[PDB]
Amino acid sequence: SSVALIVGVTGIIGNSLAEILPLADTPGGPWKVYGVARRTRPAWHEDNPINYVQCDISDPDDSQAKLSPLTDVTHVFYVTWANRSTEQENCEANSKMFRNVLDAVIPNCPNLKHISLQTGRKHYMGPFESYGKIESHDPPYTEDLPRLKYMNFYYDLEDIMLEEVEKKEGLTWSVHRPGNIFGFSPYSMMNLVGTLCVYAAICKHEGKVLRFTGCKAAWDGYSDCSDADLIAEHHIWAAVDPYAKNEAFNVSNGDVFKWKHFWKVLAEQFGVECGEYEEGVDLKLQDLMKGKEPVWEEIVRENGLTPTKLKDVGIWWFGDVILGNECFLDSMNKSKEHGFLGFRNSKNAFISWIDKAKAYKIVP
Ligand SMILES: NC(=O)c1ccc[n+]([C@@H]2O[C@H](COP(=O)([O-])OP(=O)(O)OC[C@H]3O[C@@H](n4cnc5c(N)ncnc54)[C@H](OP(=O)(O)O)[C@@H]3O)[C@@H](O)[C@H]2O)c1
Ligand SMILES: [Cl-]
Ligand code: NA
Structure with missing residues (x-):
């Protein structure tokens, strides 16, 4: 039992x-x-x-x-x-x-x-x-x-x-x-999808392009999640x-992806213009989202959202630590050999967690 x-x-x-x-x-x-x-x-x-x-x-x-x-x-x-x-x-x-x-x-x-x-x-x-x-x-x-x-x-x-x-x-x-981790929880201290959703929501609210806040190894190299x-x-x-x-x-999910393509996915889900990799200029969420507390509250009010504070859902340091660095892969061989054959299509999963953030009214 x-x-x-x-x-x-x-x-x-x-x-x-x-x-x-x-x-x-x-x-x-x-x-x-x-x-x-x-x-x-x-x-x-x-x-x-x-x-x-x-x-x-x-x-x-x-x-x-x-x-x-x-x-x-x-x-x-x-x-x-x-x-x-x-x-x-x-x-x-x-x-x-x-x-x-x-x-x-x-x-x-x-x-x-x-x-x-x-x-x-x-x-x-x-x-x-x-x-x-x-x-x-x-x-x-x-x-x-x-x-x-x-x-x-x-x-x-x-x-x-x-x-x-x-x-x-x-x-x-x-x-x-x-x-x-690609997941759901506005309570989490490290929530990439949540963080990226809030960023994208703000860009949409302000009529701004979803600029890519990260390095070339993240944009163009292989990542997993x-x-x-x-x-x-x-x-x-x-x-x-x-x-x-x-x-x-x-x-990990048993596949690889590039942010080049996931960023386009993000943009599409929020109806926002997609930024491309910006050479020789370095871009952090922490900088771009500085002072955006009142803009976020306006978004929450205008869209009857779950009442969150920007610091509880926009975990900018964590997003910058991921997007600002190369992703180093792990192996699932041992899991598979011991009998765990579970997997996820990371692109499909990404869309699903974005949808969940919207269904629970964290973002519009
Ligand atoms: N999230 C990621 O992308 C990521 C990636 C790789 C590894 N990990 C690892 O996974 C582990 C942490 O898990 P997580 O990211 O799943 O955590 P999380 O999303 O931040 O959730 C933490 C949970 O623990 C609760 N909590 C915190 N302090 C508590 C306390 N003192 N007493 C009772 N409950 C407490 C929180 O609720 P309350 O605040 O209300 O108490 C919350 O429910 C870490 O070792 C982390 O490094 C995370
Ligand atoms: Cl870790
Ligand atoms: Na899933």
Whole structure:
């Protein structure tokens, strides 16, 4: 009898897990689902409501209070993180949160079977702070690569999980390492599609061309990405497949694309003129969208949108970090060899997530 604890339930993956876990034909089902986040749940309709639990996992008292009673939990899906200005700080804050979850859950869940930990491709590249300062691995990235000799909160979380799994015989684990996520959640700290949608909406509102804010390697080189639903399916697969247990796995869509073409897709979905690559002039979202708070609010008012603030949906630093750099590919061989054959057409998926942003009235 399967009982999920989604930690970070309003997040970009938490949300997909929340929609998918309760479906009738979901492997491991029928699933009971608990969902944890700090903010109150948004007032949008759920086809299959989950048991929502308000908790700050960084507080040991609150996590103990909120999660100890949840004694029927079989599977933990850890899909959150704390974003801090230095990687030392990231290790500090992220380790406490994760240890808080495990300390409350492991002693109190007699049927606990599995811990699914989501990290990412920075496993192979090193922390945001190291970018361009540090030698990283040769792509395509495979899971047999050794850890870089530079601190990474991902490594710290893995070690905690391995330690803590020895508390309970039978308890297995998995690690999930996506690249850039194409998904839905206006609650997310890193949401590329959302960010790009808001930018495109503003361009349309102002009668401006959708200028390309990025580098040539992003425009004209190969990129890949990781679909939020596919990632949720990957978590679920590890939860149910014996060949997935006690292994780290990459998750990406199984195809490649170029922003040259995705940018044209974006433009078409918003009815806006498409910018081409601008040589020898460097263009950042952070710069172009500076001071656009009141223009965004005007858009929300004029189109009866969900009332968002520009900083909560236009994650410009994240979009610039992606579009301003070359994309280094990972490999899905290991996933496929262990039995995960899921994939997504990234172009079709992109349109679908843009449509979802419009259906939930984040953008017009
Ligand atoms: N998003 C991407 O494009 C991307 C790409 C590759 C890897 N990853 C990795 O995936 C992991 C993070 O997942 P994500 O991007 O899916 O996160 P996310 O979209 O930013 O969602 C985070 C979720 O956790 C909740 N949360 C944050 N702090 C909490 C706390 N103290 N107590 C309880 N809930 C808390 C948030 O809700 P509240 O704020 O209301 O509490 C939210 O529901 C990271 O390791 C990240 O590096 C992300
Ligand atoms: Cl990452
Ligand atoms: Na999809």
